[PDB]
Amino acid sequence: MDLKVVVSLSSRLYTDEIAKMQQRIGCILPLASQNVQGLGLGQVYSLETVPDYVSMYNYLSDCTLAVLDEVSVDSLILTKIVPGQTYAIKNKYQPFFQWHGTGSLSVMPPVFGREHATVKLESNDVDIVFPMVLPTPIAEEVLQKILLFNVYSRVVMQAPGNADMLDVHMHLGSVSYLGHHYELALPEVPGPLGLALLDNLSLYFCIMVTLLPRASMRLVRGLIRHEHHDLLNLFQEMVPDEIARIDLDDLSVADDLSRMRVMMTYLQSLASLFNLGPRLATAAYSQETLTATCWLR
Amino acid sequence: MDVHIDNQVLSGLGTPLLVHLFVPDTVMAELCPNRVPNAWCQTLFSDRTGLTRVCRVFAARGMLPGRPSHRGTFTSVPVYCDEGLPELYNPFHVAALRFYDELVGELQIYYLSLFEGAKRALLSRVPVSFSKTRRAIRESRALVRGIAHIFSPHALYVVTYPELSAQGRLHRMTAVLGAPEREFRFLISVALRISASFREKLAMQAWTAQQEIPVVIPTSYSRIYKNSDLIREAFFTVQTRVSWESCWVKATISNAPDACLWIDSHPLYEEGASAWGKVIDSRPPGGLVGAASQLVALGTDGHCVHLATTSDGQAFLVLPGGFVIKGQLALTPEERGYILARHGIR
Amino acid sequence: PELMWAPSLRNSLRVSPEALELAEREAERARSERWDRCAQVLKNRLLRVELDGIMRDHLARAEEIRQD
Amino acid sequence: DPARLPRDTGPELMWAPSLRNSLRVSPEALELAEREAERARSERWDRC
Amino acid sequence: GPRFTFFQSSRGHCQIMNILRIYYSPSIMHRYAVVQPLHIEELTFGAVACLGTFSATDGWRRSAFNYRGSSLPVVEIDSFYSNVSDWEVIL
């Protein structure tokens, strides 16, 4: 088995950028199959396009990732990602994330700003931006946040008396972490592929809203009329009118089984939609030297 | 025939009754050129002015009528106005629509022009969308009729067909002035108080130009413009026939979104309906030098008189020739709330 | 040649204390004329669309004639 | 107290004469537009 | 806000005051238009001083100047001969 895939440049890499490519050693880069362009994320995320973070998500998920370990002039060595090998990955990204959780790892587009993952290359007509590496809970939280932002910023733009544009950019806003809050990069238009993702998500939503187990309605009504739980704080002691008007019928068990059957199958389908982008299973991330043995799941 | 079954099931919260429409492609060409929009319902009253709640309307363009007599877009007008029993109609009654894709252009429509045309026309289960079931079987030519539109003297096509008891109680409805009157005289009232502010600012000052914006001007400016030639400042008040495209109210609605400016432009003496309510930026890294370049290009427009409104409560007038006359903006917050409710949400 | 006044903020307009008072009165006499024309042509369109109501009601009353 | 000068071109500091700091006025076209619009106003005088 | 500019020339001081007046001709009426000279001391539009001479042929080769982050363009007057004078007012 081979992992060593060498990529030549085409012109003399200047000595001002060999220092920062020495600084970016052990990071991850997306492949194309060699050539120089597309070996990175500049070809689908440029300055011209509004960053949708979904077409570049399509490119990074659809293509096998690659580790960049050695940079020389006119030649730099890459290493592919093939399942069954436990790659050594160093967390070398300026929005810092300690892997104290030691969970599964995730790759994402550079949603933390263009500057943090870019590198200029004045040798050839190619520029390289880098994919972001970040743990599973932050990645899925930022994923649902960027989808909720690109679906609600547009409807806030649809408001004629849009008195509060800055409401969602400071409430949604930053990312949830105990160490700090790290502000991200926000598009204004969702792009085509983002609305395709929200289209399939809303399709799953309207299919699953046709079947609700009616016993659970009674449980949340009873718990609202019990003590207000800390998990129940989002209701602030209120029964919504909709759950009051879909409980006109009684409690059954015959429809409940097939309801739950189609709910299991459609939640597994939704999980297959949201397990998108390539994933890493981690064994024993070493803390003192910032390296992690990980294999492709 | 999609947007009617779209908005029919949608607006059941804030509207009892829903009327469906066509809009030709010639009647809104003077509203927004180049097909830039692709809505919001707020029907104000004739003598019961006040303020009312807003309702969203959905629509589509580029999809053709079954009538080949004209080929245009799709809209629809909600009706929710009549208190309690809906059998009464309010006569001489505007219903405003805000057709948009990103709030440019307005649509003023009457209840007479709507309803006179309407009368002139006439192991569990999934539940079906009930109201779409009767539109496919109609498919006829008599459902659509031609209505002389009152705001713009053109044809506006309605669609209605004998659906059910909501549209069945519509065609029996009749009942026993000032809905286009109030907004125009309200514009002339705020224009007269702003022109009075300019009058008293020119009075308390020496009646002199401070020339806030720098331009070079020729020595024959007192010749090619005659002495005290403020005939454009004279007939400024008749020329402002529009207001919510005009920048004057645009600063008041911009209070909800500090160093911003909106500019109206009226020509030197009747070159045409020039423009209303353009934008001077300070936010992006084009910067204050780009604002200054756009501002001096505004000031060197030798055949257009510009009116400048600020967000913080100040008004400015720009004479062509770089002369600026300061002024106040301070209006009673009742009209402010009336304006921001007329556009949108407080 | 041709001489241009230099841009400074002490350059004066040709002073106008008296030409603005008659100005807005002429403006109001013109705009009442325009608004009355617009309301006149508006009521012309309104009587035009109101008359077809009574024509439709006449042809609705004519049903009782058709069996008599 | 103003000053008089022939020409210059293309500044960066604002209060300096230029070719872009000149208002672009055509006298004959403005007199023509002014006269024809006075006649439109004079027709508007006698309407209602 | 006042500015410090530098000047390379191969002329006499008699020429340097006239050509500097013609060079500063926009800025003088810029300051005149924005700020009227209310007192009698604002009329001084700065001054000049000979910092010295150098070689007129090999003069002012460009170079770069790095701090730890950034790089401004910078000229390099090479093999300079320093000679300070007093201030002669531009007007």
UniProtKB/Swiss-Prot annotation, chain A:
Protein location: Virion; Host nucleus
Subunit structure: Interacts with TRX1 and major capisd protein/MCP.
Pfam families: Herpes_V23 (PF01802)
Listed GO CC annotations: host cell nucleus; viral capsid
Purpose: Structural component of the T=16 icosahedral capsid. The capsid is composed of pentamers and hexamers of major capsid protein/MCP, which are linked together by heterotrimers called triplexes. These triplexes are formed by a single molecule of triplex protein 1/TRX1 and two copies of triplex protein 2/TRX2. Additionally, TRX1 is required for efficient transport of TRX2 to the nucleus, which is the site of capsid assembly.
Top-rank taxon: Viruses
UniProt cross-references to InterPro entries, sorted A to Z: Herpes_capsid_2 (IPR002690)
Family: Belongs to the herpesviridae TRX2 protein family.
HAMAP family given in the database record: HSV_TRX2
UniProt keyword annotations, A-Z: Capsid protein, Host nucleus, Virion
A GO term for molecular function: structural molecule activity
Protein name: Triplex capsid protein 2
UniProtKB/Swiss-Prot annotation, chain B:
Protein keywords: Capsid protein, Host nucleus, Late protein, Viral genome packaging, Viral release from host cell, Virion
Signal peptide: none
UniProt superkingdom: Viruses
InterPro entries (UniProt xref): UL17-like
Keyword Nucleotidyltransferase in record: no
Biological processes per GO annotation: chromosome organization
Assembly and oligomerization: Interacts (via C-terminus) with capsid vertex component 2/CVC2.
HAMAP family reported in the protein's UniProt record: HSV_CVC1
Name by which UniProt lists this protein: Capsid vertex component 1
Species of the source: Epstein-Barr virus (strain B95-8) (HHV-4)
Taxonomy of the source species: Viruses, Duplodnaviria, Heunggongvirae, Peploviricota, Herviviricetes
UniProtKB/Swiss-Prot annotation, chain C:
Subcellular location: Virion; Host nucleus
Oligomeric and partner information: Heterodimerizes with CVC1. Interacts with major capsid protein/MCP and triplex capsid protein 1/TRX1 at the pentamer vertices. Interacts with the large tegument protein/LTP.
Provenance organism: Epstein-Barr virus (strain B95-8)
Annotated transmembrane regions: none
Included stretch of the parent chain: 20 to 87 of 570
Family according to the record: Belongs to the herpesviridae CVC2 protein family.
Protein name: Capsid vertex component 2
Region (Interaction with major capsid protein/MCP): 1-35
Biological role: Capsid vertex-specific component that plays a role during viral DNA encapsidation, assuring correct genome cleavage and presumably stabilizing capsids that contain full-length viral genomes. Participates in the interaction between the capsid and the tegument through interaction with the large tegument protein/LTP.
UniProtKB/Swiss-Prot annotation, chain E:
Originating organism: Epstein-Barr virus (strain B95-8)
Descriptive protein name: Triplex capsid protein 1
Bilayer-spanning residue ranges: none
Subunit description: Interacts with TRX2, MCP and capsid vertex component 2/CVC2.
Subcellular location as annotated: Virion; Host nucleus
Entry superkingdom: Viruses
Role this protein plays: Structural component of the T=16 icosahedral capsid. The capsid is composed of pentamers and hexamers of major capsid protein/MCP, which are linked together by heterotrimers called triplexes. These triplexes are formed by a single molecule of triplex protein 1/TRX1 and two copies of triplex protein 2/TRX2. Additionally, TRX1 is required for efficient transport of TRX2 to the nucleus, which is the site of capsid assembly.
Family, per entry: Belongs to the herpesviridae TRX1 protein family.
